[PDB]
Design a binder for these strands. Sequence first.
DNA 1: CCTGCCAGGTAAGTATCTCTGCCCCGACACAGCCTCATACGCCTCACTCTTTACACACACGG
Length: 205
Amino acid sequence: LGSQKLTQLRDSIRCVSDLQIGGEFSNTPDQAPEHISKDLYKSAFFYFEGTFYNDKRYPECRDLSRTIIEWSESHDRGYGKFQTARMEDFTFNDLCIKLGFPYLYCHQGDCEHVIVITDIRLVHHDDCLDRTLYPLLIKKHWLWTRKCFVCKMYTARWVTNNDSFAPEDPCFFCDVCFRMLHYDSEGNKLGEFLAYPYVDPGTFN
DNA sequence: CCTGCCAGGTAAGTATCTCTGCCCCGACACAGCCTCATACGCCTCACTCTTTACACACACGG
Ligand SMILES: [Zn+2]
Ligand SMILES: [Zn+2]
């Protein structure tokens, strides 16, 4: 919406980089997920027409745009001049943008999201007209779902590397069999493996 | 212990090239401008058969 106040679009974009509980569980089969990446690294920014808009809300945030400026001032590699804003006071229709032209949304540091604007049209009925649900993700890709590699009847809850039983190196196991190729009879490691929690983005967001 | 003329056979002759040193050279670098010509390279696009996933359907059989 043209008054939706960015940091509202930001808080609503359903990516899976706002998931993926970190940490390696190689000796902890049953571990409480302490913090999803959404909670930990709340910093993010929108790049729009030279200017940056940094999510300065949530003072556990930081300035991800800063880094870029650091090498646009020294050793100019294209891109000339740059600017930065706060993204919190700024709402939509406060910008000076092009349509159909790629712009950036970087959240969680390295996930990059292109923010092409398809078209600006005035409000008209035959739509919701609501405000609560208004960001309104109306299309999504229906991605593929990574299933377990031992059995094919469940999804990939666990990703293991350097395993001692996995044919492939990054091997995706459902929780059932993951508990059965490792962690035997007391929940103690078998062989060697680095097991990380997998979110299976075909399922989420 | 040598020495030689004649017949027969043969034969002419005419008629109808591969190195090898060696002086007197072209083409290398490389300088700016400059215009158009040629080559390379790299990522974005296409597509195409062949699976790949996934909601749904439909007998099937006793
Ligand atoms: Zn993301
Ligand atoms: Zn399994």
